[PDB]
């Protein structure tokens, strides 16, 4: 059920998007399969212009189905904006449980709209699968007992290696400690706020944003573990699949194995980056509320 495999992103204030994780992995898998299939032979390299154009057509059709939930998604953005801003004239200062109920109800409607369009998304996914497998089935060798692996090598060098270097230049585990330190600082402040104030609207707003940041952190932690596991696996596997020959059936298996590893890595790297953006966009607004409490109001 894709209803339990959707990540929600809020990369900038007033913006919200969703990713159906198995659809993102599935589309990315067939993209690697399509590029590996045309880079296997020198004479098919020119097909990359067609592959690039076809992926854009897939992305445009997929986004069009996603846009059918825009009114429901915009209603969720409105609710979040009201719940996060005490100065919103519509923020009626309702109990934290009532705030959570409204937000969960609006979020449920977005997930229901997404589930309602599953068939539409599936038709697009199945076309991307056909596109990639069509090229894969065309792959050929002069001698099927000595197939070249230059396509696997060229594809890794030109499409994947830059992504591995980018992850290795970052310190994803230190990003996790930095986020945990921010959550702890907000938790210490929140307890101290309750001692001073009774049933203050800022306590409810801070609890609301802090709860959202805890969930974003958990998803970043979940995706970071996949990134760390997959960066090592890809580096170890790529060495076994290049500068050598394979029998065609084994070459085909290696291409599918590599596409599988790349898609799991890419899915989590892409989602971790958007979730990182979301965490810090929420923390800026939360820190603005802290400064308002401490330095604007004396408190």
């Amino acid at each position: 059920n894709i209803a339990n495999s959707i990540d929600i992103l809020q990369e900038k204030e007033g913006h919200l998007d969703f990713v159906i994780i198995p659809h993102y992995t599935f589309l990315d898998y067939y993209k690697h399969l399509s590029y590996n299939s045309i880079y296997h032979k020198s004479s098919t390299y020119g097909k990359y212009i067609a592959v690039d154009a076809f992926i854009k057509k897939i992305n445009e059709a997929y986004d069009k189905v996603k846009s059918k939930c825009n009114d429901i998604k915009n209603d969720l953005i409105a609710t979040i904006k009201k719940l996060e801003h005490p100065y919103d004239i519509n923020n009626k200062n309702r109990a934290f449980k009532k705030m959570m109920d409204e937000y969960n109800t609006k979020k449920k409607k977005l997930i229901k709209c997404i589930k309602n369009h599953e068939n539409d998304f599936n038709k697009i996914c199945m076309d991307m699968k056909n596109y990639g497998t069509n090229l894969f089935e065309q792959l050929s060798c002069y001698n099927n007992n000595f197939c070249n692996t230059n396509g696997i090598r060229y594809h890794y060098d030109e499409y994947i290696h830059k992504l591995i270097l980018s992850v290795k230049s970052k310190n994803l585990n230190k990003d996790l400690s930095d986020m945990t330190n921010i959550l702890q600082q907000s938790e210490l402040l929140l307890t101290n706020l309750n001692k001073k104030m009774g049933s203050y609207i800022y306590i409810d707003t801070i609890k609301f944003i802090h709860k959202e940041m805890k969930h974003i952190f958990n998803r970043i932690e979940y995706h970071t573990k996949i990134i760390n596991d997959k960066t090592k696996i890809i580096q170890d596997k790529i060495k076994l699949n290049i500068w050598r020959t394979f029998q065609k059936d084994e070459l085909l298996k290696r291409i599918l194995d590599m596409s599988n590893e790349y898609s799991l890595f890419i899915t989590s790297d892409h989602l971790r980056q958007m979730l990182y953006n979301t965490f810090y966009s929420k923390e800026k607004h939360l820190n603005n509320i802290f400064h308002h409490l401490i330095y604007v109001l004396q408190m």
Partner: single-chain antibody
């Protein structure tokens, strides 16, 4: 390469169902689109329907009440069953392979087989019906759609006695191996196929085809000959 071959009775009585088989070789039925297209003598190409994604079907609404398209994955074949048949169903029947509807081009066509029987559509206006030109002449064939079809337009070439083949896809993209003297232009409702300098090997019938909406529809065709 993937190859398609039609087979079945060439003569059908009005009391019998027109029943054809397409045997696929060089590749599997799998989740691809398996089409049946027909061409009544002297008339244009008519898309009958397709089986796709390992279980679904889209039929032309003009034939939907009397058509079935099915597969047998163990034999790697697909079938056409057209009932309530009349002399109007006499046509060359083609089976054709298609990979996606996102980019609705037909990439493999069977040679075709003659079978003799004893308003919402996007209308593709192709012109001229026939053309006669000298070697080195510029040739412009037009396709005008009754509705906006964005860039969802393809061109096919049918050389004498050969199967139809993809020439240009998505208005201006050349299929692999097609010479640079061919080009395609247009957008929305107006499209053109241009042969900058006609060569003897270009003698063929050309067809435009839209995939913006179902049913898939084709232009009436343009026969090009040397004068």
């Amino acid at each position: 390469q993937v190859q398609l071959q039609e087979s079945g009775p060439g003569l059908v009585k009005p009391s019998e169902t027109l029943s054809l088989t397409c045997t696929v070789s060089g590749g599997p039925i799998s989740s691809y689109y398996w089409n049946w297209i027909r061409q009544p003598p002297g008339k244009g190409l008519e898309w009958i329907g397709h089986f796709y994604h390992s279980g679904s079907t889209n039929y032309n609404p003009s034939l939907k009440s009397r058509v079935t398209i099915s597969v047998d994955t163990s034999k790697n074949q697909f079938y056409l069953n057209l009932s309530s048949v009349t002399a109007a169903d006499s046509a060359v029947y083609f089976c054709a392979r298609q990979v996606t509807m996102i980019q609705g081009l037909i990439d493999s066509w069977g040679q075709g087989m003659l079978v003799t029987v004893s308003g919402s559509d996007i209308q593709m206006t192709q012109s001229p019906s026939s053309l006669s030109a000298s070697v080195g002449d510029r040739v412009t064939i037009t396709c005008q759609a009754s509705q906006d079809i964005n860039n969802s337009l393809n061109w096919y070439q049918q050389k004498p006695g050969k199967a139809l083949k993809l020439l240009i896809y998505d208005v201006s993209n050349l299929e692999t191996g097609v010479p640079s003297r061919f080009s395609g232009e247009g957008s929305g409702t107006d499209f053109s196929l241009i042969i900058s300098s006609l060569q003897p090997e270009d003698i063929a019938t050309y067809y435009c085809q839209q995939y913006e909406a179902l049913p898939l529809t084709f232009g009436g065709g343009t026969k090009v000959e040397i004068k």
